[PDB]
Structure 1
Amino acid sequence: LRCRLPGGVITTKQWQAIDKFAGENTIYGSIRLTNRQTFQFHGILPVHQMLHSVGLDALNDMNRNVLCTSNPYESQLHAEAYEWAKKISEHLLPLPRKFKTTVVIPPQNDIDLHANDMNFVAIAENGKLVGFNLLVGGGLSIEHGNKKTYARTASEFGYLPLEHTLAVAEAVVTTQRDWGNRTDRKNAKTKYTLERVGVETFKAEVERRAGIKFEPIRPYEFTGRGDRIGWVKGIDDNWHLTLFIENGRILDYPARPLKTGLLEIAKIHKGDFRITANQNLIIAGVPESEKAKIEKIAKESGLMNAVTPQRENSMACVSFPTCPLAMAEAERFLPSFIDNIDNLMAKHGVSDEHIVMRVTGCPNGCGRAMLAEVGLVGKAPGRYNLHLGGNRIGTRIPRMYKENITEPEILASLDELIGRWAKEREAGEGFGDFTVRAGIIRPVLDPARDLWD
Structure 2
Amino acid sequence: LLRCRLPGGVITTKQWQAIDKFAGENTIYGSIRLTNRQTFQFHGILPVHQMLHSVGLDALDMNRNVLCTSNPYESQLHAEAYEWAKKISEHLLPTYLPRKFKTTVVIPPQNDIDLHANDMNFVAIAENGKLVGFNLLVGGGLSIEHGNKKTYARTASEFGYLPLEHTLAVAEAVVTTQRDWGNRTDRKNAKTKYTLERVGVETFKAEVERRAGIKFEPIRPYEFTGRGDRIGWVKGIDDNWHLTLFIENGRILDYPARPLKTGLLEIAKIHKGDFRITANQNLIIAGVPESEKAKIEKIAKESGLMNAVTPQRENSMACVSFPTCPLAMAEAERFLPSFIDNIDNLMAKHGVSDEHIVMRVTGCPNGCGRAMLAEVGLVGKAPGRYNLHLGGNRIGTRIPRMYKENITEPEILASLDELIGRWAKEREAGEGFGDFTVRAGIIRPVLDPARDLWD
Same fold per TM (> 0.5)? Answer: yes
Q: Give TM-score, length-normalised by structure 1.
A: 1.00
Rounded to whole Å, the distance in 2 between the matches of 1:362 and 1:149 is 14
Rounded to whole Å, the distance in 1 between the matches of 2:362 and 2:125 is 32
Rounded to whole Å, the distance in 1 between the matches of 2:238 and 2:422 is 46
* Aligned counterparts, 1:9-408, within 5 A: 9-59=10-60, 61-94=61-94, 95-408=97-410
Rounded to whole Å, the distance in 2 between the matches of 1:299 and 1:437 is 42
Rounded to whole Å, the distance in 1 between the matches of 2:110 and 2:291 is 29
- Cα deviation, residue 46, structure 1: 1.4
Rounded to whole Å, the distance in 2 between the matches of 1:441 and 1:6 is 37
| Identical-residue share of aligned pairs (%) | 100
Rounded to whole Å, the distance in 1 between the matches of 2:261 and 2:371 is 28
Rounded to whole Å, the distance in 1 between the matches of 2:66 and 2:185 is 27
Rounded to whole Å, the distance in 2 between the matches of 1:397 and 1:410 is 19
- Cα deviation, residue 117, structure 1: 0.2
- Cα deviation, residue 57, structure 1: 0.3
1:295-351 Cα distance to aligned partner (Å, 9 max, x none): 000000000000000000000000000000000000000000000000000000000
Q: Give TM-score, length-normalised by structure 2.
A: 0.99
Rounded to whole Å, the distance in 2 between the matches of 1:450 and 1:219 is 28
- Cα deviation, residue 241, structure 1: 0.1
SS at match of 2:20: helix
Rounded to whole Å, the distance in 1 between the matches of 2:45 and 2:17 is 18
SS at match of 1:2: strand
Q: Give the paired residue count.
A: 452
Rounded to whole Å, the distance in 1 between the matches of 2:357 and 2:264 is 29
1:364-402 Cα distance to aligned partner (Å, 9 max, x none): 000000000000000000000000000000000000000
Rounded to whole Å, the distance in 2 between the matches of 1:311 and 1:46 is 37
Rounded to whole Å, the distance in 2 between the matches of 1:149 and 1:246 is 31
Rounded to whole Å, the distance in 2 between the matches of 1:398 and 1:263 is 39
Rounded to whole Å, the distance in 2 between the matches of 1:159 and 1:286 is 35
Rounded to whole Å, the distance in 1 between the matches of 2:370 and 2:47 is 31
SS at match of 1:82: helix
- Cα deviation, residue 134, structure 1: 0.1
SS at match of 1:220: coil
- Cα deviation, residue 88, structure 1: 0.1
- Cα deviation, residue 114, structure 1: 0.1
Rounded to whole Å, the distance in 2 between the matches of 1:45 and 1:211 is 48
SS at match of 2:234: strand
Rounded to whole Å, the distance in 2 between the matches of 1:219 and 1:296 is 42
SS at match of 2:70: coil
- Cα deviation, residue 137, structure 1: 0.1
Rounded to whole Å, the distance in 2 between the matches of 1:416 and 1:8 is 38
SS at match of 1:387: strand
Match in the other structure for 2:440:
438
Rounded to whole Å, the distance in 2 between the matches of 1:408 and 1:442 is 24
Question: Which consecutive residues of structure 1, in runs of 5 or more, have no partner in the other structure?
Answer: none
- Cα deviation, residue 53, structure 1: 0.4
Rounded to whole Å, the distance in 2 between the matches of 1:86 and 1:342 is 38
Rounded to whole Å, the distance in 2 between the matches of 1:98 and 1:217 is 27
SS at match of 1:159: strand
Rounded to whole Å, the distance in 2 between the matches of 1:265 and 1:138 is 37
Rounded to whole Å, the distance in 2 between the matches of 1:166 and 1:376 is 37
Question: Which consecutive residues of structure 2, in runs of 5 or more, have no partner in the other structure?
Answer: none
SS at match of 2:322: coil
Rounded to whole Å, the distance in 2 between the matches of 1:244 and 1:411 is 24
SS at match of 1:29: coil
